[PDB]
Amino acid sequence: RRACYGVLRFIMESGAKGCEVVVSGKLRGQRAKSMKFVDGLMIHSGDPVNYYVDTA
Amino acid sequence: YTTPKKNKHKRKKVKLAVLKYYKVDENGKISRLRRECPSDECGAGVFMASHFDRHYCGKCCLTYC
RNA sequence: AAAGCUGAAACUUAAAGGAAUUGACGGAAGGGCACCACCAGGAGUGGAGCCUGCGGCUUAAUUUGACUCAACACGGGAAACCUCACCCGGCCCGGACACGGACAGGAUUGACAGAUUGAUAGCUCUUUCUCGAUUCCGUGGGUGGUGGUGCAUGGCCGUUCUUAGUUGGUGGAGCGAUUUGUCUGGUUAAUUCCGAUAACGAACGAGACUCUGGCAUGCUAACUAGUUACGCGACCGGUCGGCGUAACUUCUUAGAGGGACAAGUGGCGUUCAGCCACCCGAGAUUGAGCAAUAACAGGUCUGUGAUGCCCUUAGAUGUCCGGGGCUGCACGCGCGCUACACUGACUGGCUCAGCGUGUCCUACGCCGGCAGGCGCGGGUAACCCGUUGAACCCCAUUCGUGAUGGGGAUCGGGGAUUGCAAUUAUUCCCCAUGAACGAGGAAUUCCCAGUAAGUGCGGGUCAUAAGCUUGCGUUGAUUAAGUCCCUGCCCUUUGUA
Ligand SMILES: [Zn+2]
DSSP, X not given: OHHXXXXXXXXXXXXXXXXXXXXXXXXXXXXXXXXXXXXXXOOOSSSHHHXXXXXX | OOSSOOOOOOXXXXXXXXXXXXXXXXXXXXXXXXXXXXXXXXXXXXBOEEOSSOEEOTTTOOEEO
């Protein structure tokens, strides 16, 4: 939670339009889960995605 | 398994083997008991073997009857 | 009389139950939607032979994952060896590093011959030679895996789900889960807009966007693209993909920029969003790619040096080498290919592509009936193959309703190309053999215009190589412009144990 939020706060401080940080796997217990964290604006479809959002 | 066991070949340990190569007399006749290997690199450095009915060199794999 | 009134216990149990909220579901209702739905049809498939992929029965092993849409020509899975996991048999360490022992008075390495073995494997036995602290023996500790678990996981991927869905902030309503915003009604392919309005401001999806088709006798250009003209030549003013110069860009390549917006006209529409028709036009809906929120105990540990646990780890589940198997057939299913002929076969003649690939693609000459054999050239490619002389189709010939010159399965001989190796026949060619099949029962798939279907060609696999898929042209239709009846989908009302 703290680590991912630290990264969000820094990315939004740096001056991005919006951020999406996702962490997936054995977060707690023996069952695989996923935690998505979103802020600002984020586009998913069309050509603009190619040259407006960068992913890792 | 059907076979009892397959054992690896262990080299028969011989003590001080190079004393069998020379036969030095009291006044000093240094005679080579085993024959010399007549090949190029072996010449004067390798003493070719003497089996029961043949000769053999361990380096160059040269054989004579 | 049927029965009425009054009326316990032993034992047994963690809930039974009441209101209201979200979902899901209904053989409940109201709107709308889709050829993985029907209607009208087209081609079919299901019947036949054969190819492949699955179950079974065999086997030494027939390695194995996947089982409605969301398994079964799927794992890019066309397996002769390799691949290769599986079965039989045999070499190798490629067991780092540390500690102890061993040890130049030699730890250890490799091997001729004969036996041994499938093997010219010093693998092992007999017999000796040969290398020089690199090893070899014990414990700890590693390192490998197409070993196990996808129900421990990451990543991609498929599906729910191709429909229009989805969520905060602040304000409002409820003790509360929660709800409103996200809507009565019109309108759209669309939670798309108009307009209502306890909501107002927003965000994602949709749209926009990117690639591709269709138009430019306007623009910039061109011996790796062509035309027009002229000269020379060949043969009768004409034919030339016969050759050489000059104007250019119509044809060819492809950069920039134009062009289409319900814009113009007439109806219909709370004259609003918009809908139908028509003129002018190349075009008045081209085809894709990308695709939210929230989930499948969906598939994959056999893509990985992506990976946690566990199992083995030197007579190994490591790795390699010889074989065999993956294809083994009383049977049942799933994609398909060729057919059942006369709108057709056969023989000859004529005449047109497009995508895209070549360090293996191939022109030209010679020999062989053919598969192919030799010799000598071009091309790392708008340069050579190549003007990619493709097939259906078109025009002649023969056949004649006969299981027939339809169909070419199954079988016998030969002759070539790959490859170290072709038998359980890898492909390829020639002669011979000539099965079922006369349009397929219940059932069931796909599809709306350059579409369906017929028909070839290129790419991927590829030493050998397409009955597969992924693309490209070519010839080119019938029927519909609708509906919720079947099968499902979205929104709104209700009902629920
Ligand atoms: Zn020698």
